[PDB]
Design a protein around this ligand. Structure first.
Ligand SMILES: *[C@@H]1O[C@H](CO)[C@@H](O[C@@H]2O[C@H](CO)[C@@H](O[C@@H]3O[C@H](CO)[C@@H](O)[C@H](O)[C@@H]3O)[C@H](O)[C@H]2NC(C)=O)[C@H](O)[C@H]1NC(C)=O
Ligand SMILES: *[C@@H]1O[C@H](CO)[C@@H](O[C@@H]2O[C@H](CO)[C@@H](O[C@@H]3O[C@H](CO)[C@@H](O)[C@H](O)[C@@H]3O)[C@H](O)[C@H]2NC(C)=O)[C@H](O)[C@H]1NC(C)=O
Ligand SMILES: *[C@@H]1O[C@H](CO)[C@@H](O[C@@H]2O[C@H](CO)[C@@H](O[C@@H]3O[C@H](CO)[C@@H](O)[C@H](O)[C@@H]3O)[C@H](O)[C@H]2NC(C)=O)[C@H](O)[C@H]1NC(C)=O
Ligand SMILES: *[C@@H]1O[C@H](CO)[C@@H](O[C@@H]2O[C@H](CO)[C@@H](O)[C@H](O)[C@H]2NC(C)=O)[C@H](O)[C@H]1NC(C)=O
Ligand SMILES: *[C@@H]1O[C@H](CO)[C@@H](O[C@@H]2O[C@H](CO)[C@@H](O)[C@H](O)[C@H]2NC(C)=O)[C@H](O)[C@H]1NC(C)=O
Ligand SMILES: *[C@@H]1O[C@H](CO)[C@@H](O)[C@H](O)[C@H]1NC(C)=O
Ligand SMILES: *[C@@H]1O[C@H](CO)[C@@H](O)[C@H](O)[C@H]1NC(C)=O
Ligand SMILES: *[C@@H]1O[C@H](CO)[C@@H](O)[C@H](O)[C@H]1NC(C)=O
Ligand SMILES: *[C@@H]1O[C@H](CO)[C@@H](O)[C@H](O)[C@H]1NC(C)=O
Ligand SMILES: *[C@@H]1O[C@H](CO)[C@@H](O)[C@H](O)[C@H]1NC(C)=O
Ligand SMILES: *[C@@H]1O[C@H](CO)[C@@H](O)[C@H](O)[C@H]1NC(C)=O
Ligand SMILES: *[C@@H]1O[C@H](CO)[C@@H](O)[C@H](O)[C@H]1NC(C)=O
Ligand SMILES: *[C@@H]1O[C@H](CO)[C@@H](O)[C@H](O)[C@H]1NC(C)=O
Ligand SMILES: *[C@@H]1O[C@H](CO)[C@@H](O)[C@H](O)[C@H]1NC(C)=O
Ligand SMILES: *[C@@H]1O[C@H](CO)[C@@H](O)[C@H](O)[C@H]1NC(C)=O
Lengths: 485, 484, 486
């Protein structure tokens, strides 16, 4: 009356997965491949602290806005952090030429050095160096940019200035200057004493002649006139020449920059933190190496591909609910006592149900599913892509093209990831069912006609099979001629 | 008394492709590709489109005299134009950021055309009576409706210092022009100042135009030119026009209540009131299916475009390999058994019968329905802004966009076909699984009370009446009852 | 006596990767990744490419004196440029929209260089003898062959009004230059006009250039500049040049007819006369394979570049020398002698040789796997690819966007393909594990209880079965009552 049954394992469950054919399927074990949390703090990126700007923008920090003195000491950074609505920067009204391009240049810079390209006293001995305005007020007092100097006429004369600088820093030198546009002709005749002024910025690769434009303009920050801002990158071994007779905001401090590639500027009000993380988002930082995430499309660093999914769970064990042939077939029950493995046997000579587990098939299935999951996670490589671009009001076609690229990538990744989850969950369930079916077939082949097939995955022995005989059956060392006669 | 296990067959001629086999006839199939369009420029979303007819966008905004039928159009869901519009820019000139302006105007829910500068009061000394034969309407020479040609009066052109403030709480499109004469004689006769200038300045825009006088080839029977410029005055902003000549003044500006993400279609199809969720130059597409092959550029709720001609998914069995069930021991499809997918044949007192086991059939239907519905539903449509326009100097852009779309088209066309093939095979491998298991179940119940014929049929040793057959079908076959 | 079922095995060391297992040795496999280039710049679409040699594109079109070997060109499919553009813009200056001109000159079906304004006849009131050491040739000062330097004559620089009509009925590329002297004295000595202007006007182009005198750093031992501008006169359009000085006039224009959009390849590899459909900077590749890892930048109908180093798909069984419970089940190892097919039987009793090969199952499996591989290869159809893009210093953002377009695509194709070749491989192996197993069952039901099931994939006939009845068994016919008792 001895019986040996073959079955699988079930536990407390409470974890669900989705397959191609069925939804809300409950499984013994599963793995999450979707990151859905962030620390809420702007950690360091690969050991390089971000350049926080606070109440200032990139234009103000580079130009030297008076109210931006809390961040003068900056040497190395990987990305630039901005508040959602910077309040300081371009205190004097004007237009920043190629501003977004300069921001992209400055997002990735090493060994940032601020150096006086033209000394305040030596460079301009014949000009009124001092120049201030109420728009760029500092501590309740009128002031001007720290890195620029408002040259004005001295002794009723503006001598023709011709100042040349050679790049001796063996790097690329960002040089910034400005051109002043008074709102009234008399203001020009007083500041520069020349109605027809000119500005000429010349390099081996740069050449531009700015001509002052005098007209009545709406008041911005209580100033009708406008200072236009321009910038250039002087290459090593190159010389830049400024030649002017008026309306020139002369450079004072230039910046030596090490070449950087591929970083972006994050705009968020979340706090900065001492932590170091390998992937940054505006709202937080993600430490997990899961293939996909559902936090924010704009990511900096080697980040998981963004998806529009809320659940991506992959099956790693048998279905916890008690197709192929074995599970939901001639064996529609789950041995909750199978705490040693996935596939096992049963004893009735002296033991009960759910006592031993066949570690061979269990180990084979474990290795197969582990390789499947590891391949799915690992096949994605590092990106280090600063997804997210900035375009002005005259570049809306650029904005829409970038939006289309990001949206297409998002849609492809979401669709493919969800499909793979469904198909591989179904295939994993089928794989477990095939493994247990093969185990039952092996037991049947070993027993031959010395046992009766009950129908519920059990065999009733035609002889007395003591515990050691059961060990022989499970070990594969069953001796049919021993009990044949 | 014999019980035979079999599957379903019918007269279906539907054909699918699998990974291992091609041109496979199946009992049932589902289409995932939409290839039919109504051929009508139907309504999109909830608003009707705007058709420019013979006119272009430039002629519409600037006020070409032949586009007088387009003045009353206040709101639109999307813009459609004839393939090669002729009206627009009647006076030769250069429209600065014209493609950019088209992109801005496409995503506009509604607009109000208002007289930014009244024709009489704004310019008292300046003569406002200026027309040309290049812009001719009803024989008489004419000029733009929303622009005005300023010329000197009594041999004098006083300096103009006009300004306007945005009180509409919406962005205001302002259009103006700068006239470049062919010869200095026209410059000194129409403006009386040989060296003129124009300055348009706001809180975010500032540009100075100096007239350029040179001999130019005749376009629309005209040597002189008029360069057109535009700006989008933000709410709470003021625009200033200051000039001593060669200024084409704005006469009508447009308060734009802007939308988001709309485009312009170059189509010649007639319009219809379909309220369709999708739109293409040729016609409209049903968004129910996940893939379409009608037109690459699409606007609205349009499915993903693919470069494939057939994407058919199996939702049934093979009409008339793995698990060895279909084309194995069972090699015939039961055309009579139309009740379900799998079943048995009656015998004994029952002369015949083609019963269909509803358990496995309903389970398979649920599974395959979930598969197909997952394939269709997992696809999201969102909104399509496919297509861009680039000028002659943005060729590098035109290729890059061409790289994008084609690239995506190379992915979706490939994967989908794989998805159609890879799953179809499995679908078939699903069906032959179920019946096989079903057979095994019967083979388990009868034990030695029946002999295995070999063709999916069991010959009962004992007499199996209708009640006994129903006992076998339900799985409650009483082995002790019929042991003898 | 006995009949055994088994699968084919050989000594092939070709290994593959599957979802569940890695380093799986298979009897046969197919490579789907191309990693070989001949190192030769084969011509594409049957048209020989244009190799500029040591000349930049600007030097070639402007007519650089050293770039005289590139004058006699008629047609090309793509442009090849050496990594060292030594020759080009010999006189310092700025080339307006140079990247766009390179983009629009990468593919020209018919290229003709015609003297739009003859040197001897167009300018009788001006001196045309303008040369400089910046563009010197054969040891003496020279100038661009396709441009002309106009200066004053008899101490006078009269007004210039020249017009050309597009009678070529093609796209007339016209190049001109504006000279910016370093000193006012040079301007007054060469052009005799301190305030000059150059107006270039057509039906769709109109630009006024004002000379900009300023002290400039010496680049080519020259403190002046010559800014270069160009336009494409449309058919039926007339171009007009009007200038009182500082004009570098056109001498030879080009009647272009643009073709299928292509790019520019930077390569120093030898230009061989092989013919190919795909081109890479390093060489040319297979293109019949759907995937490649030679170079991300490609020209022509090229396979989708992937970041994979091994993309191999199984076409046979697992090579086990001497799921579904087969291959790893009842037959632990496959026969190393059966070479006529993938599945077969073992002769015994009358003929103990053991030769057999079930042709029907083997051929069906071959057809299925061949259809799988052919579908995977063929379903990827790619048209002409021109992924190469060029952007200036002020278009870095654009460049990054292009990179984001490229790398992202590389992230997709790499992830899917490998994953795909991981999945189907396993399936293919499982497919084999189906067939053989089914074959075993087909024998079992055919032999019923006339044979003892040994369990190693064999049936030991209780009766005496000669070669004829064993062949009938392999034919699927076996009279069970005939051999019930023997
Ligand atoms: C740096 O950022 C701060 C914060 O935005 C700036 O303070 C702001 O300064 C403006 C004047 O420049 C203030 O506007 C004032 O509003 C009152 C309202 O009654 C009006 O009467 C005044 O005539 C003036 O328009 C604004 O209120 C003030 N905001 C705050 C929060 O302090 C500061 O000016 C910036 N500094 C630089 C150098 O950019
Ligand atoms: C994938 O599996 C193959 C074998 O199927 C590996 O090839 C074999 O790798 C061994 C590694 O030491 C090489 O050394 C040989 O080892 C054997 C013992 O296995 C030893 O008897 C020999 O004297 C020799 O030292 C061996 O040459 C090589 N080839 C063969 C035909 O055995 C391969 O390394 C595996 N790859 C991975 C990534 O695991
Ligand atoms: C076309 O390209 C050739 C080859 O590059 C140019 O020849 C010039 O060759 C010399 C060596 O013979 C290169 O070295 C330079 O020599 C000068 C003295 O001639 C010396 O002062 C420099 O310091 C340097 O060592 C020289 O770079 C090279 N010139 C250029 C522009 O690359 C030839 O001049 C080129 N012709 C034109 C019209 O661009
Ligand atoms: C506007 O386009 C039309 C053709 O689309 C041009 O042709 C005129 O068409 C109208 C009817 O729409 C006729 O009444 C005129 O006689 C046609 N004139 C010519 C010269 O063909 C028309 O010229 C265009 N008008 C403008 C101002 O561009
Ligand atoms: C080139 O690509 C083909 C794509 O099918 C690879 O396949 C070969 O195709 C040729 C031509 O049909 C056959 O003669 C070979 O027998 C095929 N070989 C295999 C392994 O399929 C081919 O291998 C590729 N060439 C390489 C990688 O050098
Ligand atoms: C499952 O529930 C039982 C309830 O008795 C509890 O003892 C056991 O610890 C639970 N196991 C898990 C893994 O939650
Ligand atoms: C689906 O699964 C979730 C698991 O969180 C469970 O809360 C919910 O009740 C289930 N619903 C159905 C209909 O099975
Ligand atoms: C300074 O520049 C003005 C404007 O071009 C010019 O008139 C004047 O002669 C110049 N003076 C010197 C000393 O260079
Ligand atoms: C399949 O083959 C039959 C037989 O020639 C043919 O009539 C039918 O059109 C084919 N269908 C397809 C889709 O190729
Ligand atoms: C367009 O032009 C054609 C040709 O002159 C004319 O017949 C037709 O009526 C015009 N349609 C509109 C809408 O202007
Ligand atoms: C108009 O502006 C010009 C600018 O050149 C100036 O010369 C002229 O005096 C102005 N008109 C009057 C009436 O002042
Ligand atoms: C002409 O009237 C306009 C309208 O304000 C004004 O700008 C201009 O000064 C007037 N001309 C005069 C007063 O000479
Ligand atoms: C391996 O098999 C191939 C194909 O049959 C054969 O050409 C080769 O000689 C074999 N090598 C060895 C060492 O048996
Ligand atoms: C290009 O210049 C290099 C300089 O070393 C020279 O070796 C090579 O022969 C030159 N090639 C041509 C085609 O002029
Ligand atoms: C040359 O052009 C200038 C500027 O356009 C003009 O002032 C002068 O009269 C012209 N001279 C001749 C001879 O055409």
């Amino acid at each position: 009356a001895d019986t040996i049954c073959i079955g699988y394992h079930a536990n407390n469950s409470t974890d669900t997965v989705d397959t191609v054919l069925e939804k809300n399927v409950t499984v013994t074990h599963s793995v999450n491949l979707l990151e859905d949390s962030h620390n809420g703090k702007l950690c360091l990126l690969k050991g390089i602290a971000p350049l926080q700007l606070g109440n200032c923008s990139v234009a103000g920090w580079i130009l030297g806005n008076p109210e931006c003195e809390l961040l003068i000491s900056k040497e190395s950074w990987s990305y630039i952090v901005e508040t959602p609505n910077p309040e300081n920067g371009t205190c004097y009204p004007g237009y920043f030429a190629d501003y977004e391009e300069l921001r992209e240049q400055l997002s990735s810079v090493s060994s940032f050095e601020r150096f006086e390209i033209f000394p305040k006293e030596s460079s301009w001995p014949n000009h009124t160096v001092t120049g201030v305005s109420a728009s760029c007020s500092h501590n309740g007092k009128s002031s001007f940019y720290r890195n620029l100097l408002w040259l004005t006429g001295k002794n009723g004369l503006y001598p023709n200035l011709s100042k040349s600088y050679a790049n001796n820093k063996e790097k690329e030198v960002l040089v910034l200057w400005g051109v002043h546009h008074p709102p009234n002709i008399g203001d020009q005749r007083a500041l520069y004493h020349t109605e027809n002024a000119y500005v000429s910025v010349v390099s081996s690769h740069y050449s531009r002649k700015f001509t002052p434009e005098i007209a009545k303009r709406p008041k911005v920050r209580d100033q009708e006139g406008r200072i236009n801002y321009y910038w250039t990158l002087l290459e090593p071994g190159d010389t830049i020449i400024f030649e002017a007779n008026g309306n020139l905001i002369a450079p004072r401090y230039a910046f030596a920059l090490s070449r950087g590639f591929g970083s972006g500027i994050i705009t968020s009000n979340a706090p900065m933190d001492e932590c170091d993380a390998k992937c940054q988002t505006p709202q937080g930082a993600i430490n997990s190496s899961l293939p996909f995430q559902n936090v924010h499309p704009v990511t900096i660093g080697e980040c998981p591909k963004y998806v529009r999914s809320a659940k991506l769970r992959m099956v790693t064990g048998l279905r916890n609910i008690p197709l192929f042939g074995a599970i939901a077939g001639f064996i529609e029950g789950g041995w909750t006592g199978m705490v040693d493995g996935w596939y096992g046997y049963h004893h009735q000579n002296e033991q009960g149900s759910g006592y031993a587990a066949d570690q061979k098939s269990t180990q084979n299935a474990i290795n197969g599913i582990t390789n499947k999951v590891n391949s799915v996670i690992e096949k994605m490589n590092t990106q280090f892509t600063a997804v997210g671009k900035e375009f002005n009001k005259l570049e809306r076609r650029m904005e829409n093209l970038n939006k289309k690229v990001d949206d297409g990538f998002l849609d492809i990744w979401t669709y493919n990831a969800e499909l793979l989850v469904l198909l591989e969950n179904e295939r994993t369930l089928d794989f477990h069912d095939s493994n247990v079916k093969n185990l039952y077939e092996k037991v049947k082949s070993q027993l031959k006609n010395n046992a009766k097939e009950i129908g519920n995955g059990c065999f009733e022995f035609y002889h007395k099979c003591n515990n050691e005989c059961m060990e022989s059956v499970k070990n594969g060392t069953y001796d049919y001629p021993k009990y044949s006669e």
